[PDB]
Design a protein around this ligand. Structure first.
Ligand SMILES: Nc1ncnc2c1ncn2[C@@H]1O[C@H](COP(=O)(O)OP(=O)(O)O)[C@@H](O)[C@H]1O
Ligand SMILES: [Mg+2]
Length: 734
């Protein structure tokens, strides 16, 4: 609805054309959904039923014959284009896709699907962000207000006013669906400190994004923003925190992927001062840390991004000397991919050869080149009360220097985030902040690897949290009504994958113990995985060979479906041997290295990327458990920028990954249809025209089976479909 408040003219969709559209001829007895060959979901009409095989005619026009068993029911035209699909009485997998595509063709960006708030990505200016709409949405609840994020924000505000507890808003979806723009509009709505957030956004987007296959500006890390509020419901301050940074991107790149945008921006020649002081040859192919990926791509101009980022750095809380120091640090990180470390003759010890790039790195950090080389080649460890040296060959020192590079990059990013936060806040008292989070969803490619596995595990944990919250809400409703229906927690329905991943003897534990084995390779890792899990656990299964994929080693049945991964490269990218003497050298530099490495018990060698990822995920989960969540799902309708055409398979895959259909099925598994007794008595009596006892007599006098309904005191539990049939026959009797 859009009347009485001057909303968007197309937002109404009521009392203007719905009356003349509900009479469209759509014979449900002959209209069904047929699986296509390209879009795999296309609507079609059946001329006649010829037994098992039925001829289907589609909108595009086809005369193929299709078996009758897989073609399934089609929604009535009268209930089509409904605002909320949560109470849809004909739940179908293509029903959601068709409703979303029709609404998007009608320019319905926001659609309610229960607790979820599906928001597609258009490419145009939307007048829905008018401050008049913001003022109108104030004081409105979920039901009365039209579908928009303002309704859920007002619900969270009311929860703060009455329940007096933390509320968190969660946004997830496929990378490139508009996470940054959506969260910018969200934080702007709570703003109406916003300018500080807008100016700080490019720095984080440049230091924590990389060009993936699907998206060129995907945010690998997770961003959490807390909006501190006062006692009287007024904005106090803001602080941000980042989680789950990917050191793998810093250390390794795929054949069709790029590193973080900072290195490529620095490689631009429009800022000769940085290149001059960093001793850079301006050729990305001269550095192994960057050249192994994609050198450069089109559809981007990193010069403008560098200008935006350094302009934000200049006019901010801090000065430019530390910006120069950060540029020096990133240049040194680029420089670490050049030493040779030739093995000594007749000995397993490793000695350096190219003592030129080492000198450059030492000058950049202010360290001693000889001391740095001695520390890298001959680390020193304290045994008992004395100190001894350790021998290290070329592979060990290579792993150590890679770990040092990724660790210093992560610490520099964390220090920058902390500095921006310390600039951001203001000294007003803070009470019961509001959290905003955005993390990429169930990303699935044809070459799934360790990073994809970590992202899938994080999203798996998030889905587990969402299911647990939904079960808690359902049980709270059951206790309110005093009757429990299917009181089985949904956490165990999903804990199988988490146990396969996180629990001991799982994939992560096996990889961690294989990293420390004397002579361990990837084939041995796969062999141990098969010996430990093939047949023991239902989730683990053999890989599949479909559509001519390159290669797969093992497959898991995730929450979104079957995913096949790849093994090669996991061992190299999981080892994180952090040298300690080099850290001690870092603590004595004449630079920001003291601030970055201020604090530095498991052993240094027994450190893995998986362990740090798991502990960070646990910290994020234990932080999020204390706040009441609010789930927002964002999807991209079209792979290109044209809103006119939207690909059906892509939307189907994204909907399956996001679990909106799964969520609505979980909601409808119980008794979601609840209505008030008096309203039922005074409205639905027209079903067969001629307080608790009167309502019971009325419902029992309408030829209704007693097993389908459940009587209560305030809210009556009704099975899905009963209310729809009751109301559709009531209209006929009018
Ligand atoms: N509500 C919106 N209206 C118009 N354009 C949008 C909207 N949301 C996202 N976009 C488009 O998305 C693009 C960037 O998406 P972004 O949020 O950077 O993706 P990612 O989350 O992968 O970084 C922008 O060019 C912008 O035009
Ligand atoms: Mg983003």
């Amino acid at each position: 609805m859009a009347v009485f408040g001057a909303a968007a003219p197309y937002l109404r969709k009521s009392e203007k054309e719905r009356l003349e559209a509900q009479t469209r001829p759509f014979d449900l007895k002959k209209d069904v959904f047929v699986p296509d060959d390209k879009q795999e979901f296309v609507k079609a009409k059946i001329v006649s039923r010829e037994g098992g095989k039925v001829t289907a005619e589609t909108e595009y026009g086809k005369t193929v014959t299709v078996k009758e068993d897989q073609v399934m029911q089609q929604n009535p035209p009268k209930f089509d284009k409904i605002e909320d699909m949560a109470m849809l009485t004909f739940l179908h997998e293509p029903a959601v896709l068709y409703n979303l595509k029709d609404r998007y063709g009608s320019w319905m960006i926001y659609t309610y699907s229960g607790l979820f708030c599906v928001t597609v990505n258009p490419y145009k200016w939307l007048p829905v962000y008018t401050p008049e709409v913001v003022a109108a949405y104030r004081g409105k609840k979920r039901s009365e207000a039209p579908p928009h994020i303002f309704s859920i924000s007002d619900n969270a505000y009311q929860y703060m006013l009455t329940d007096r507890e933390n509320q968190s808003i969660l946004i997830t979806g496929e990378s490139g669906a508009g996470k940054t723009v959506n969260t910018k509009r969200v934080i702007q709505y709570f703003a109406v400190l916003e300018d500080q957030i807008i100016q700080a956004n490019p720095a984080l987007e440049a230091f924590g994004n990389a060009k993936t296959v699907r998206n060129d500006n995907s945010s690998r890390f997770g961003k959490f923003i807390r909006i501190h509020f006062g006692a009287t419901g007024k904005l106090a301050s803001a602080d941000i925190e980042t989680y789950l940074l990917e050191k793998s991107r810093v250390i390794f790149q795929l054949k069709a992927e790029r590193d973080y945008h900072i290195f490529y921006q620095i490689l631009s020649n429009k800022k000769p001062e940085l290149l001059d002081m960093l001793l850079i040859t301006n050729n990305p192919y001269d550095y192994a840390f960057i050249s192994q990926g994609e050198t450069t791509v089109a559809s981007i101009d990193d010069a403008e991004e560098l200008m935006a980022t350094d302009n934000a750095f200049d006019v901010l809380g801090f000065t430019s000397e530390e910006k120069n120091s950060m540029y020096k640090l990133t240049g040194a990180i680029m420089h670490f991919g050049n030493m040779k470390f030739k093995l000594k003759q007749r000995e397993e010890q490793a000695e350096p050869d190219g003592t030129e790039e080492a000198d450059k790195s030492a000058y950049l950090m202010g360290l001693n080149s000889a001391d740095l080389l001695k520390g890298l080649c001959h680390p020193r460890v304290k045994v008992g009360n004395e100190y001894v040296t350790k021998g290290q060959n070329v592979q060990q020192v290579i792993y150590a220097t890679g770990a040092l590079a990724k660790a210093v990059y992560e610490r520099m990013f964390n220090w920058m985030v902390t500095r921006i936060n310390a600039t951001l806040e203001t000294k007003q008292p803070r009470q019961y902040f509001i959290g905003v989070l955005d993390i990429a969803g169930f990303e699935i490619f044809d070459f799934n690897s360790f990073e994809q596995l970590c992202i899938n595990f994080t999203n798996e944990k998030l889905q587990q949290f969402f299911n647990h919250h939904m079960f808690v809400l359902e049980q709270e409703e059951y206790k309110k009504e005093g009757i429990e229906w299917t009181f089985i927690d949904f956490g165990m329905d999903l804990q199988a994958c988490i146990d396969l991943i996180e629990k001991p003897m799982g994939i992560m534990s096996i990889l961690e113990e294989e990293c420390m084995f004397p002579k361990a390779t990837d084939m041995t890792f796969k062999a141990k995985l098969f010996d430990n899990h093939l047949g023991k656990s239902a989730n683990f299964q053999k890989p599949r060979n479909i559509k001519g994929k390159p290669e797969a080693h093992f497959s898991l049945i995730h929450y979104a479906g079957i995913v096949d991964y790849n093994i090669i490269g996991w061992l190299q990218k999981n080892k994180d041997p952090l040298n300690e003497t080099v850290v001690g050298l870092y603590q004595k530099s004449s630079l920001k290295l003291l601030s970055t490495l201020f604090a530095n018990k498991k052993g240094s060698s027994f450190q893995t990327v998986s362990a740090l990822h798991r502990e960070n995920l646990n910290k994020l989960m234990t932080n999020l458990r204390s706040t009441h969540p609010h789930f927002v799902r964002c999807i991209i309708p079209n792979e290109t920028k044209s809103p006119g055409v939207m690909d059906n398979p892509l939307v189907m895959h994204q909907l399956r990954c996001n679990g909106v259909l799964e969520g609505i099925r979980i909601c409808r598994k119980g008794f979601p249809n609840r209505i008030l007794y008096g309203d039922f008595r005074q409205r639905y009596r027209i079903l067969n025209p001629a307080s608790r006892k009167g309502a019971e007599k009325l419902l029992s006098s309408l030829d209704i089976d007693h097993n389908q309904y459940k009587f209560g005191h305030t809210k009556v539990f009704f099975k899905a479909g009963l209310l729809g049939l009751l109301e559709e026959m009531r209209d006929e009797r009018l």
